From a paper:
[name] ([name]) catalyzes the de novo synthesis of palmitate, a 16-carbon chain fatty acid that is the primary precursor of lipid metabolism and an important intracellular signaling molecule. In contrast, Type I [name] found in eukaryotes and some actinobacteria are large complexes of multi-domain protomers that are composed of one or two repeating polypeptides that are each encoded by a single gene and organized in a symmetric or pseudo-symmetric assembly. The contact point of the condensing and modifying regions is the neck region, a flexible linker composed of two short unstructured loops which allow for continuous swinging and swiveling motions of the two regions relative to each other, maximizing ACP accessibility to all catalytic centers. hFASN is a validated anti-cancer target and is over-expressed in solid tumors including those from breast, prostate, liver, and lung tissues.
For this effort, we selected Denifanstat, an orally bioactive molecule with antineoplastic activity. Denifanstat ([name]-2640) blocks consumption of NADPH by the KR domain in both protein preparations. We found that the drug binds the same pocket and interacts predominantly with catalytic residues from the KR domain and the nicotinamide of NADPH. To the best of our knowledge, this is the first cryoEM model of hFASN complexed with the first-in-class anti-neoplastic inhibitor that is undergoing clinical trials and can be used as a platform for rational design of other novel hFASN inhibitors.
Numbering used by the authors:
A (entry chain F): 858 to 1124, 1217 to 1244, 1251 to 1271, 1312 to 1316, 1325 to 1347, 1375 to 1393, 1400 to 1802, 1805 to 1866, ...
B (entry chain E): 858 to 1122, 1410 to 2074, 2077 to 2112
């Protein structure tokens, strides 16, 4: 019969380890789980056990992924064809896995021998530990749980390592597959789809397992990328073919983005940031997380307070939108409560009569009832030595006393008192003990300071607001405002077309390109001004998500878009040219070698010239170079009304060749008849079904065609092969059958048939292209290369062009005109594009703390954004294997990344660091990610903790500020990574909040003077960091906030770097 | 899961009709039987009936043939993979049929529309009847019984017809396949092995059926070989592939071959049978009426020396009253005129009567009788300068011998063809596969007859001018002489030897083709050659090293490794891998840096071909010169073409069909390589032409390195020897005919007449004159005659009756108009059966007019005006030698024919009388009678009949017999 496996991933279920095989947030059945169940079925059929049956899997193809639900059961049916040696796995009648499985009759232990490494004896003392290996895997989208974490150790290149054996054949072989992708330079999720051959011999597997000092038996895994073979224990995976799996948008966390900006106390309104500011002020001035609010304000206040993670809201603070009513409201409100009244001298008099003190004015009236307090304690937190923390502990150590303690920062305007107070407010000492500050942050020296011991601070006590900051005359405090949802745009002459969300044509926008921040115009490349950029089928396959971006050959990062393979326009000299590019051709400008450039003749329009390069190069390479079309031959050209088909028709008819075309429309028949008069009514067939084969065979006298230009697939491809004549040439221009490894029956080759896999894409990564270029040029001179039909969409209608030519109704080529041709001469451009952060290759960028968790990922992101001169500052240098691997990759791929021990906490250290950066090139960016943690309750806090926690962040940022101001006139980025702890408050880390707030003040001062400045209030970071590596596993709720993923973190950083705001925040709600 | 189908061929079993699907004497399960079984399994799985389940079969592959035993049951297990749409038929765990089966979701009745014929049928009235269709099929080896005889009618071209419907799908689709293979130029037993797609829609099948006047449901069948499709009713077979299954050597037709040579040792009734009016038949009947006085019946033939009453006495003895009559003959068969006539009125007659011998015939002073002697089993060997190597029995290297070539009995002379004496002929892998039977003769392209031997693909020797040349031929290279076009000849260089040069033409042509013309190898390209120790591998190594290419070679032994290292010193230790394993792939991928190799010249198979494909680099070229994976249609993963990889199916044998400038490119490449020294001949192990069998078995095992060369003639020391005549060597005699001579077949439109005509065409006859009183009537005759005419033979269908002397003279003149009369075959026969009691002198006259008088006139006219006559063959019957019930006249005519032939041979003229037994598969016993015992003898099959006739035509005996005992 059929063996049925009810896959239950329940707690008491004997297959519960499968819940730990999470990929992109979905529990997927492992590719090796199918092998295990097929092995079990074969053992049952043969009467043996799995451990007693060596097994061989051949041509294993995984047709779909099985999603294991949280609750329920998935039934997988394994059917064996013993005579055919084949198997199949079905979920609900749908084919899941197919291939050949059979008993290994003569098992060879010599097969499971580790092949010699291509670069043996690396002499590398640093390796990738298990934690680092799975951190790197998680960064790529592999959320493997503890049961599938079997790589205890691996080399930095992923070519060798150690595999933990846990009496499991699914987990061990899945870790074997993990090792095969650990060393891959590809980015993103890669799932196994085809494996050429898997050999499992448990007999030699048992003898290859050796126990460690832990007493857990392990094996040694080796990945030979040259041989395409993975061996570990008694398993030999050969020919594994992983295919990119798109990362689902559901797993993409949506973060809350806010800007930290100073808000004066004294400044339609319901739907304005003033209401949010008042609500946040009330939340800040509160004993605990309980929010007792009594009231059309029910539709805004709960929504505005919802982003706050720890706020417990009880909506029925007093909000309303006369003397007796005010008295009743005051009586209802408790001591220290806030009354928020919205209405269109009399109001102030009524508030005074009701003993209400106004603390906010938005022109929304904010009133707070004074609370009886004794003489306050004045503690200056402006001491550089942090000697004030001892007095802070002394006053806050008396739990019995409720006397207010007013902190003051009258000096050192860059004082981080805000974050310190934010963290103290939720600490058990100081929740109601009034740990209130007062900061005089003068952004300009012209504005005079507020003298102490005067009426201004008396008004401060009168208001009794927890946060009181004097910023350029006005009195207020810093507060969080929701960031604008719109992506910032700038007028740029260099832009490109990108799909912001993969697979969505409506997401197509023009984005700032990397050809403006860096323009390294040198021989071998040319910054060509694109006038017309045509679309190809690959562009839609990319923009609709049907084709993975990495399937395009060439070194492409995970951020850049690859839309457009061809353009026409101008040159640096101004000559009218048309060029062929591997990608990025759908842009305002393209950097391209002159080898892939032609000269547009005088008669040709620039618009019509924009359809020739891709289509005619493809046709020439397929027909002349590869197909070797002799004159007078017979050709079957599929999709002859398309681009490549039309050029092949023109080329063949230039040689006087009999042509058979397949078109799916009578309109396309008419168009081809009109375009090429030499075609006969018998020359046209149907491209939407197989009957073209019967048409060709009948009209060729059963002989067939000498050439086939096949873009069709499946049964149409098989019929096209059947159309071949003796000595016939088959040119495969399509990719579906090739990508799916569909079986081509090897009996057509008995007709002296040559099968061509024609891909005009290796010309951009390997020379021989000059032959095709010369052929295209010669066809241009002879008139053979004729411009195609061009449907024109302007630059602003790129989405319209994409969704038009996706319908398939277009005839010829669809052209996106970027810049209109000027009729003034044939020898003699601003556009609002989304701001994307890009960096010149000639500038140096410093990441203090760049060897840490966020530091390494930010460095990699900067590399992908064009940074070629990088300086990473660490207090200890390279210690971990992960850091060594990342720095090694960056150095190998061409970047001048330099590790420096110089500490920014010292001014001389910062000067030396800036000098080291300037040695490579001008300092274009400074990133302060240096951090240490002395987290603990205030009673355990010591001044030395404040010194050593503020030196990495506060004094380091001050030194970076000074040195950049005095030696970096060309600096473009000054980014410090603060924390949401500073923004709102995290009990147990007060000095951390102080350092972060001081960095925020430094950045605000920098931005006020017109210098670059940016402070990012980061929430918990998920993939890497300090809290994740130490303790936090996966995504646990931390202080009401989910740990943000690195992909979202880098996207948010890209967004933040293109905003005029001084300080912005980012976190993900639980 | 597995649906069990116990196939029982017992009479009570529902599957008893399967006994009628006999092929080559074996009851085979039809391919359509597998189709119906899988269809039933799919219907059961979907809970439907077959008639309610339109079905599609795809990529049906038949891996083995199921033999249905006479006693017992064969169980076929069918397992369905619905998810993958695949099925599998297994018998005792062995895979039989695999493919894709699924329900036709959208049945299109427009699919079952008969395609238009490429040309209109001119002979619409002249079609092939059911009897003719299955007579032809049985001749090809298809012994279809009544249940599988569903082709009611068929056109001569075999592209259309009608199929009878018996509510049986297996029979209907089998007849569809039969109609598909009916119009096939290929001869032999062809069985389906692969079908691309089969669409069965019973819904439109019911509509397509129609009822004739016989109340029998029929369906029109159309076969389109241009579209490679066959449509009939609601069945659509596309891409049917049939491979010629060799006919089993366990042929029960082991004829008893005998000679007929003269063997010296109441009231008497004398009846003179010498009268030419046969008026004595009534007297013989009156004599046989009596009982007592009829004991001494002494019928004497005195006047005519070729009276032939021997058959009269033999057949009349079997009649009731023959032994009682004791019929005794006095035949004065004086072979020479100078011999004295034995007087029948003297003491000689008294002595003959006293002897009482059953048969007494006088022959030049000897009183004897005609007796049957067993024919010598030794094949006649003759000294000829034109002989070829052939396997007498396929698959047996022991049965390898030299047979007289077609050039000996037919010397051709025409521009564009050269007759070159062969000094050294080289064995090739295809030759070994042909001799061992692993390769069918039909796999080699060309127009090859059934008896044609295709051993030998390459040779070296001297042309007609005496120049030293080595050439390449499609086949027949293992001969003492080769007739080939000059475009396939290379001049042997002075420093080369004929033995040395006899290794280049195939090996280096193939290597140069595959590498340069197909592979387009460029200098410096990493290149992988499989089996580099063999010929083609060695040539590819030589070419690649001449181009300075890095070479990876796979060899099966360390000795071959050492030989390649010594021969090509440019190969390092890292250039060699293992060909008997997959490890060459790992070796190549490691030593190439994982990139691959730019070219792969692969002759390996199965996993060793997939590994080689995996060895390919980006822009790699795969040159597939092997055939196993090509012939088996093994799947090839198409993801390799994502590496810009070109896959070449390289077959050098395609150059012998067109011989255009495409071959001239390879010829120029080989000549240039010869003149630059790139083409260097391989090591040759030489076996003398006397012993070719040991060469075949030596190279079959595979220890040989380089080439195995058979030396036909030792190269004499000279440059251009004027003579160049092949040495006279003894070879098995084979009947061949000049192309310039005309051959007459009296009664050549009959069954045996048509078979002999086809055999003569296969033996080189180009001018045929078939005679028939009524001309062409049957569609089989028209099809055969038009096929011969289209082949190029001048076939003349004359109505000149050989009964009259004037008619024979006109027939001979008609033949001489085409060309000199090289041979006359007398097969004209009319039959007037019945016992002697119900017999008439007119019946004797009618029966003897075609045979007795026909041979009279043929002998006379050939003597007068046929100096170049080589054959005078008449077909007698065993009924003459022994006797048949109620066939006295037939025996008399046959014996007269035999006497005529004996006299002709005695006078030195050609003459042959064949006493045929029951003739099978065609003729009179096939139409009138029904593998049925006739007079204790089985009907001899026509393949055996033609083989025995070939044996007889090369014998010195006047009369021989052939029959098969039951």
């Amino acid at each position: 019969s059929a063996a049925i496996y009810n896959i239950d991933t329940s707690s008491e279920s004997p297959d519960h380890y499968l819940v730990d095989h999470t990929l992109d947030g979905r529990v997927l059945f492992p590719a090796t789980g199918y092998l295990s169940i097929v092995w079990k079925t074969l053992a049952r059929a043969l009467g043996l056990g799995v451990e007693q049956l060596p097994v061989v899997f051949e041509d294993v193809v995984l047709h779909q992924a099985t999603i294991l639900p949280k609750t329920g059961t998935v039934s997988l049916e394994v059917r064996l064809l013993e005579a055919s040696r084949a198997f199949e796995v079905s979920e609900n009648g749908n084919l899941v896995v197919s291939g050949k499985v059979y008993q290994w009759d003569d098992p060879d232990p010599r097969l499971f021998d580790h092949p010699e490494s291509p670069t043996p004896n690396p002499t590398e003392p640093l390796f990738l530990a298990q934690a680092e290996v799975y951190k790197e895997l998680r960064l790529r989208g592999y959320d493997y749980g503890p049961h599938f974490q079997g790589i205890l150790e691996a080399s930095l290149e992923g070519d060798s390592g150690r595999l933990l054996w846990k009496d499991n054949w699914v987990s061990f072989m899945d870790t074997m597959l993990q090792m095969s992708i650990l060393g891959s330079a590809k980015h993103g999720l890669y799932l196994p789809t085809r494996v050429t051959a898997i050999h499992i011999d448990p007999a030699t597997h048992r003898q290859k397992l050796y126990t460690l000092q832990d007493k857990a038996q392990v094996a040694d895994v080796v990945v030979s990328r040259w041989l395409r073979v993975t061996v570990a224990g008694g398993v030999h995976i050969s020919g594994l073919h992983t295919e990119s799996a798109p990362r689902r948008q559901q797993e993409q966390q949506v973060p809350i983005l806010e800007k930290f900006c100073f808000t004066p106390h004294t400044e339609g309104l319901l739907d304005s940031p003033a209401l949010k500011a008042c609500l946040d002020t009330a939340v800040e001035n509160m004993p605990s997380l309980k929010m007792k609010v009594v009231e059309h304000l029910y539709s805004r206040i709960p929504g505005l307070l919802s982003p706050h993670p720890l706020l417990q809201l009880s909506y029925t603070l007093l909000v309303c939108n006369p003397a007796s009513a005010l008295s009743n409201m005051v009586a209802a409100l408790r001591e220290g409560g806030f009354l928020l009244l919205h209405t269109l001298d009399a109001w102030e008099s009524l508030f005074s009569r009701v003993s209400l003190r106004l603390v906010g004015l938005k022109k929304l009236f904010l009133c707070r009832r004074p609370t009886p307090q004794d003489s306050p304690i004045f503690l200056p937190v402006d001491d550089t030595s942090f000697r004030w923390v001892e007095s802070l502990k002394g006053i806050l150590a008396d739990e019995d006393s409720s006397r207010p303690v007013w902190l003051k920062a009258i000096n050192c305007a860059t004082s981080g008192v805000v974050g310190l107070v934010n963290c103290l407010r939720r600490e058990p000492g100081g929740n109601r003990l009034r740990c209130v500050l007062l900061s005089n942050l003068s952004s300009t020296s012209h504005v005079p300071e507020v003298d102490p011991g005067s009426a201004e601070l008396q008004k401060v006590l009168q208001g009794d607001l927890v946060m009181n900051v004097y910023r350029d005359g006005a009195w207020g405090a810093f507060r969080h405002f929701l960031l604008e949802e719109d992506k910032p745009e700038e007028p740029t002459a260099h832009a490109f077309v990108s799909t912001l969300t993969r697979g969505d044509l409506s997401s197509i926008r023009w984005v700032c390109s990397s050809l403006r921040h860096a323009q390294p115009t040198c021989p071998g490349a040319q910054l060509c001004t694109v006038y017309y950029a045509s679309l190809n089928f690959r562009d839609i396959m990319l923009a609709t998500g049907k084709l993975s971006p990495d399937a395009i050959p060439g070194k492409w990062t995970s951020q850049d878009s690859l839309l457009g393979m061809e353009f026409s326009g101008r040159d640096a000299s101004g000559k009218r040219v048309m060029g062929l590019v591997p990608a990025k051709g759908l842009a305002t400008s393209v950097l391209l070698s002159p080898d892939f450039l032609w000269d547009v003749p005088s008669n040709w329009t620039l618009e019509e010239a924009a359809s020739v390069p891709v289509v005619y190069s493809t046709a020439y390479y397929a027909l002349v170079v590869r197909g070797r079309v002799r004159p007078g031959e017979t050709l079957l050209i599929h999709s002859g009304s398309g681009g490549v088909g039309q050029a092949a028709i023109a080329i063949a008819l230039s040689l006087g060749c009999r042509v058979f075309t397949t078109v799916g429309s009578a309109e396309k028949r008419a168009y081809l008849q009109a375009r090429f008069p030499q075609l006969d009514s018998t020359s046209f067939a149907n491209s939407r079904d197989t009957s073209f084969e019967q048409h060709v065979l009948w009209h060729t006298g059963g002989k067939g065609v000498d050439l086939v230009l096949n873009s069709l697939a499946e049964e149409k491809l098989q019929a096209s092969v059947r159309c071949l004549a003796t000595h016939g040439r088959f040119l495969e221009i399509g990719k579906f059958d090739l990508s799916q490894n569909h079986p081509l029956g090897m009996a057509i080759f008995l007709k002296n048939v040559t099968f061509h896999g024609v891909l005009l894409d290796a010309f951009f990564n390997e020379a021989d292209w000059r032959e095709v270029w010369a052929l295209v040029q010669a066809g241009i001179r002879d008139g053979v290369v004729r411009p195609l039909k061009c449907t024109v969409f302007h630059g602003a209608q790129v989405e319209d062009a994409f969704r038009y030519m996706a319908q398939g109704k277009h005839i010829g080529k669809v052209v996106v005109q970027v810049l209109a041709e000027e009729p003034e001469a044939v020898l003699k451009k601003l556009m609002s594009a989304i701001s994307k952060t890009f960096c010149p290759a000639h500038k140096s960028y410093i990441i203090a703390g760049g060897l840490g968790g966020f530091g390494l990922e930010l460095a990699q992101w900067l590399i992908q954004r064009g940074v070629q001169k990088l300086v990473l500052t660490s207090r200890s240098g390279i210690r971990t294997g992960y850091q060594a691997k990342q720095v090694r990759r960056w150095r190998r791929q061409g970047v001048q990344v330099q590790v420096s021990t110089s500490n920014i906490s010292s001014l001389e250290g910062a000067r030396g660091l800036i000098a080291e950066a300037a040695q490579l090139g001008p300092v274009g960016g400074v990133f302060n990610l240096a951090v240490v943690l002395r987290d603990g309750l205030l009673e355990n806090q010591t001044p030395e903790f404040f010194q050593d926690v503020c030196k990495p962040k506060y004094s380091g940022t001050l030194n970076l500020d000074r040195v950049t101001r005095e030696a970096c006139p060309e600096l473009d980025y000054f980014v410090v990574f603060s924390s949401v702890s500073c923004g709102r408050g995290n009990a147990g880390q007060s000095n951390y909040g102080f350092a972060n707030s001081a960095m925020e003040r430094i950045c605000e001062k920098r931005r006020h003077e017109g210098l670059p400045g940016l402070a990012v209030q980061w929430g918990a970071i998920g993939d890497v960091g300090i809290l994740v590596e130490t303790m936090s596993t996966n995504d646990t709720i931390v202080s009401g906030t989910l740990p943000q993923r690195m992909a979202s973190c880098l996207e948010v950083l890209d967004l933040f770097l293109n905003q005029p705001h001084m300080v912005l925040s980012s976190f993900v709600l639980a």
